[PDB]
């Protein structure tokens, strides 16, 4: 069905009413989201069906209809925009300067913005509008707030 570029909500009718379990990015006919949102299951776009193409639990990413298309990266200096799409709420751009996740295999940009778990898969953008990663996989710091990594895939 709908294959227009943009941000989309991922909904389920399995629970009470219609519940938003996450968000995704449609680009070049490929739907990109976080693995824990769909668990690799098929998606519906009206009367059309989207089937998983690539996925990885450790990276926490999955693509539908084709290979991962998002290859822009955080420059390590500039502010970014989380295009947050919360459950029952309108999409809203929030500007922030990312922090760092220091890991044994290198550093990852991280955004300290607290949103419901149903906001997972919302895109993080650079000043050119390019998706530099997805929001929804990070850690809970000492005061209870969430800090998400800027999770980016690999464009083969």
């Amino acid at each position: 069905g709908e294959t227009t570029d943009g941000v989309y909500r991922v909904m389920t009718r399995r629970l009470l009413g219609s519940t938003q379990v996450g968000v995704g990015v449609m680009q070049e006919g490929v739907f990109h989201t976080m693995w824990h949102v769909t668990k690799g299951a098929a998606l519906r776009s009206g009367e059309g069906r989207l089937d998983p193409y690539w996925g990885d639990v450790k990276q926490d990413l999955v693509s539908y209809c084709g290979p991962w298309k998002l290859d822009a990266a955080w420059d390590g200096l500039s502010e970014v925009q989380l295009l947050a799409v919360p459950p029952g709420e309108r999409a809203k751009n929030i500007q922030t300067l990312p922090g760092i996740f220091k890991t044994k295999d290198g550093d990852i940009g991280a955004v300290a913005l607290d949103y419901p778990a149903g906001t997972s898969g919302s895109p993080i953008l650079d000043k050119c509008g390019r998706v530099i990663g997805l929001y929804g996989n990070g850690v809970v710091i000492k005061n209870g707030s969430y800090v998400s990594a800027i999770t980016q895939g690999k464009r083969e």
Binding site: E2, T4, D5, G6, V7, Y8, R9, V10, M11, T12, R13, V21, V23, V25, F31, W35, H36, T38, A41, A42, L43, R44, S45, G46, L50, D56, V57, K58, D60, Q81, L83, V85, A91, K92, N93, I94, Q95, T96, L97, G99, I100, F101, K102, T103, K104, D105, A110, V111, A112, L113, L125, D126, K127, G129, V131, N137, V139, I141, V147, A149
Partner: protein, 39 residues
């Protein structure tokens, strides 16, 4: 059974709300894709 609904365009908004801090955190990533704080 999951379905998708359009939420909008992916554009940078000039004059957007600026919030949030920039923390430098030591983290670890396990085989299940779960992050945790290293101390």
């Amino acid at each position: 059974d999951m379905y998708i609904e359009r939420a909008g365009d992916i554009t940078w908004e000039k004059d957007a709300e600026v919030t949030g801090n920039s923390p430098r955190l030591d983290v670890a990533l396990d085989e299940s894709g779960d992050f945790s704080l290293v101390e």
